[PDB]
Amino acid sequence: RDVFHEVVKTALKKDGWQITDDPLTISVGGVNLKLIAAERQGQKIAVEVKSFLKQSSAISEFHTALGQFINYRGALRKVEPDRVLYLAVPLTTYKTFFQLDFPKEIIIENQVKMLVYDVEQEVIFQWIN
């Protein structure tokens, strides 16, 4: 987990993003919810890092990742509404699991913004807004 977290931080910095908080902690509405907070030229983001390791089903990993995304997005609206949340996904996962019809559709239905990163090279491949 720490490794993939560091890969995404590296990929962000290579594109000129400034890491401002890690973890970004969010407390709201009676609940305390490691997200990466970053910014570039005043544009603020939060990144939910996932590795989608073969150790568990991609679908089980997706359930938790999706729920986290919706909760974090909902919380951020009411705490830091200018900070946009992205789900960070490895390119390999993006090209396989996320090209299957169902996950692709759920992501779109739920406006799940994504940061697709190449793990080996530690770079940002694509932002999906």
Q: Which partner, a second copy, Cl ion, none, binds residue 102 by CB below 5 to 8 Å per kind?
A: a second copy
Q: Considering CB distances under 5 to 8 angstroms, the limit depending on partner class, which of Cl ion, a second copy, none binds residue 91?
A: Cl ion
Asked if 84 and 44 touch (Cβ cutoff 8 Å), the reply is yes
Closer residue to a second copy (CB): 101 or 120: 101
The sign of the torsion formed by the CA atoms of 113, 117, 122, 124 equals: negative
Cα-Cα-Cα-Cα dihedral sign, residues 32, 82, 123, 72: positive
The count of residues in the chain is 129
126 touching Cl ion, by CB under 5 A: no
Q: Which residues bind a second copy (CB under 8 A)?
A: 28-33, 59, 62-71, 74-75, 78, 100-106, 109-110
